[PDB]
């Protein structure tokens, strides 16, 4: 029997695709509206939504067109993590990019941590999927991942926060907003993992992907816009 939740998530994957495609085009069109020194801010933001767009395009093949639960296949975990592996670092660079051999140590710390977080997650999810339920590898990977994540938040609310003050108001204020994305917006994913780790089922997975879809829109388009307006405001 055809499933309404399945049809719904099929639709939402298109929403992700179109939202990401549209953000991508916005950033690319408004790039020359920027001083030549700020254009990289738009390009990096566009590259991220672009990657997420390709991710959401290929989700169409994971669910399929059937509407049947049992028809759900593909490699949606790999698709999502390859997206995450590329986009999360490209999102984190927006911090030292707004700041300015003086923003490179911060960047280096951000990305090592981020890489530990993402691949930890991948190892854990893959183990959970293969077993069809809780594994301790699934638990410890996660915890290590969360540690990396908390380390990132620490840098943003200390290192980044302090350097922010030495920047012009609209850049400083953007940087301070951006932090909350990583603290609150990014919290959605490890929460979704926790549910997955302790509550198996295809349907709950579809719901997590739904929520991730909104998280992503916020954390990629939203987060990109914030930084883009600062560099346009400071382009006068």
**Residues of the shown chain interacting with ligand LFA in the complex, contacts defined by CB under 6 A:** 36, 39-40, 43-44, 47, 51, 54-55, 58, 60, 65, 75, 78-79, 82-83, 86, 108-109, 112-113, 115-116, 119-120, 123, 141, 144, 147-148, 151, 177, 180-181, 184-185, 187-188, 191-192, 194-195, 198-199, 203-204, 207-208, 211, 218
The CA-based angle 74-77-80, given to 5 degrees, is 110
Count of residues binding ligand RET (CB under 6 A)? Answer: 18
How far apart are the C-alpha atoms of 225 and 215, rounded to whole Å?
A: 15
Nearest distance in Å: CB 122, ligand LFA: 9
189 binds, among ligand RET, ligand LFA, none (CB under 5 to 8 A by kind): ligand RET
Closest CA to 39 of 223, 232, 172: 232
Residue span 71-100 as binding mask against ligand RET, x where in contact by CB under 6 A, dash where not: -------------x--xx------------
């Amino acid at each position: 029997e055809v499933n309404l939740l399945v049809l719904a998530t099929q639709y939402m994957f298109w929403v992700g695709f179109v939202g990401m495609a549209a953000g991508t085009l916005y950033f690319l069109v408004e790039r020359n509206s920027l001083a030549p020194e700020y254009r990289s801010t738009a390009t990096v933001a566009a590259l991220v939504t672009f990657v997420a767009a390709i991710h959401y395009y290929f989700m169409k093949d994971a669910v399929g067109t059937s509407g049947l639960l049992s028809e759900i296949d593909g490699f949606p975990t790999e698709i999502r993590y390859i997206d995450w592996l590329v986009t999360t670092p490209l999102l984190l660079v927006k911090f030292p990019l707004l700041l300015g051999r003086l923003g490179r140590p911060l960047l280096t710390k951000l990305v090592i941590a981020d890489v530990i977080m993402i691949v930890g997650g991948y190892i854990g999810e893959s183990s959970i999927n293969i077993a069809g339920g809780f594994t301790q590898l699934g638990l410890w990977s996660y915890l290590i991942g969360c540690f990396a994540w908390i380390y990132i938040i620490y840098l943003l609310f200390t290192n980044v926060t302090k350097a922010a003050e030495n920047k012009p108001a609209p850049i400083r204020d953007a940087l301070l907003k951006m932090r909350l994305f990583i603290l609150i917006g990014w919290a959605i994913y490890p929460i979704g993992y926790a549910v997955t780790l302790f509550a198996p089922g295809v349907e709950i997975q579809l719901v997590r992907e739904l929520i991730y879809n909104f998280a992503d829109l916020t954390n990629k388009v939203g987060f990109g816009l914030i930084a883009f307006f600062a560099v346009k405001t400071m382009s006068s």
